[PDB]
């Protein structure tokens with residue numbers, strides 16, 4: 001047992017779907033908690049997508065998962081979508097929320113609370129590591145890319161928000177006006193933690209068992225260290 | 239025979255429940271959940287808290303307790319077909335677990351996010367806190383545990399050439415644990 | 427909403443809002459409502475709230491049920507943060523456009539720098555109509571006149587869809603062959619590679635080139651349309667014009683101030699002394715958004731929020747006219763459900779049992795001095 005190559009190919013397929021789901025939503029889940037926690041956001045508002053901070057932190061704080069899941073999926077499956085799978089995860093996460101809550105519940109216009117576009121970067125990462133399949137290599141040029149591409153990647157969206165207007169006697173860009181018109185409040189609680197720091201790890205991950213095999217290898221969040229490759233990207237702005 | 243739509247339950251069970259919640263807070267987030275110091279907040283929101291905690295303790299008790307006591311006592315010999323039937327049902331647990339994580343960590347969290355932006359808080363117990371923290375997290379950490387326990391107590395991995403695949407299926411769903419074995423560092 | 431749960435003595439010793447007024451109380455979608463008033467930044471600013479070196483003049487309401495059309499403090503438009511100077515006193519003006527039907531509790535707040543949204547009195551304003559009615563037009567220095575409600579909406583969408591699609595496309599492409607267990611094992615026993623098969627690498631670099639190409643093509647297309655563009659305008663306005671109040675003519679000195687626990691009233695013993703010629707009377711003590719009036723001397727007409735106006739809340743042992751030259755000591759009691767409903771009563775938990783308010787004196791022909799008092803406020807239990 002189990003029977004034929006016909007059926008084997010079958011269970012291994014219906015597995016692929018179930019697994020892909022798990023992998024994908026568990027990413028969406030913890031990846032979104034990450035972005036959130038570290039960036040109370042620039043991402044939230046059109047008028048925070050600036051040239052210095054937004055351009056600097058976003059690709060930096062964001063390589064982590066790509067980098068990590070990259071070193072599992074390619075190393076162990078030769079599946080080269082490590083990076084992009086995370087990015088798609090975050091994006092769906094953020095959108096369903098921006099739409100059904102940010103606008104849906106409290107009424108912020110979508111043209112305001114839209115998220116930053118991320119796919120390009122991830123493709124650069126995924127492909128660069130696929131072709132010329134050294135991590136070291138991807139870490140230097142691949143992250144480099146992810147970093148740089150970020151802003152130009154958002155420019156087609158951002159740009160029309162940056163057309164100038166004389167608003168009651170002061171220069172302001174569209175986006176400025178947006179945040180000025182659509183009243184938000186303070187910032188106002190943070191330590192979104194106790195069970196998020198620990199508890200809801202050390203029931204998810206005991207992964208361990210006591211049996212080892214923990215692909216708890218993220219020495220490939222060295223692959224992070226393309227912050228440096230990143231933080232060119234901002235001295236890139238003016 | 240094989241893997242059933244209990245997996246259908248596992249998906250809808252959250253989705254109905256949470257879509258009810260989203261309705262419930264959608265309608266009471268405005269009217270009741272605005273001013274915490276008002277009596278309608280006591281009844282529609284505060285009461286909600288102790289309702290869920292009790293329910294959570296209770297479920298988590300019966301749920302983990304259930305599986306542990308129904309732990310497959312002598313599993314030394316139980317067919318490879320069950321060692322297949324099982325790390326299917328096991329996967330269903332892990333699907334439910336992920337779905338749960340999704341709601342808790344993406345949905346309800348970035349919602350709390352929006353909520354903070356629009357009302358200056360009156361308690362550490364806003365609607366979206368009653369929901370994000372004390373309803374969402376518990377639910378999915380409970381689902382978490384169950385998954386873990388099921389596997390620990392059910393599957394014995396827990397102490398052409400289509401060919402070089404087809405027959406790599408005696409102790410395959412080792413895979414089962416290259417993946418609980420790698421949500422691993424993925425989650426934290 | 428949001429005050430009440432916040433430390434009573436911060437709420438007493440931070441910003442005093444007075445001469446508050448609301449142009450209208452019921453308003454149709456797309457109609458305007460104007461909020462005016464003065465606010466004084468208390469000279470004894472708590473510790474533990476960064477001075478308002480960079481503060482911002484905000485509005486408290488459940489999201490954009492109004493949009494803020496304009497906000498002025500001093501003569502000036504204030505779309506930035508501003509530097510407020512302690513002790514000083516300013517006039518503001520906030521202009522709101524209605525956008526969502528409902529009864530909203532609108533406050534004039536003040537966001538400060540380090541610690542604290544400083545939330546002024548809230549007034550309920552009702553909006554009738556359909557959100558589908560709302561418009562937010564703006565004309566650019568670029569000729570075009572756009573509706574902010576939806577400007578660039580479709581564009582945003584396209585790009586996110588387009589890219590999202592690609593991410594899918596790439597994962598999709600690999601996921602047409604089997605994804606996990608066969609691939610896993612093939613890596614395991616024997617070398618991998620059999621499984622990434624150039625022309626896979628053709629496609630890979632296909633994507634890679636295509637992507638950077640689309641990015642620059644797109645970017646310079648975005649640049650051809652929208653050739654005139656500026657960076658986000660920001661940075662704290664300094665130089666806020668304060669209000670040139672004249673020296674008050676009454677001076678008051680407060681020895682003892684007490685409140686019953688539990689209770690609804692604060693009492694203080696003030697020595698009022700009336701310099702400058704015209705018999706003066708005490709008409710009001712404003713403390714933390716809550717206004718206590720002697721209805722024998724002063725009567726609000728501003729439509730002040732009901733739950734915060736104590737119409738005859740304020741009682742003075744002797745409030746006959748105080749003749750000019752004279753000086754008397756008087757026992758004064760601020761009393762109202764409001765004192766408990768807004769939890770000023772919670773001063774008992776604050777680590778600094780000192781209060782602060784404004785007194786308003788009116789002379790015979792009805793012109794008024796305002797003096798500010800502050801002192802320690804001691805509980806009594808027995």
Ligand code: CUA
Pocket residue numbers: 427428486531532533547548549
């Ligand atoms: Cu919120 Cu008054």
Ligand SMILES: [Cu+2]
Pocket residue numbers: 441442466467468469798
């Ligand atoms: Cu003052």
Ligand SMILES: [Zn+2]
Pocket residue numbers: 005006398400401404
């Ligand atoms: Zn065969």
Ligand SMILES: [Zn+2]
Pocket residue numbers: 189350351354367
């Ligand atoms: Zn929160």
Ligand SMILES: [Zn+2]
Pocket residue numbers: 451729
């Ligand atoms: Zn009225």
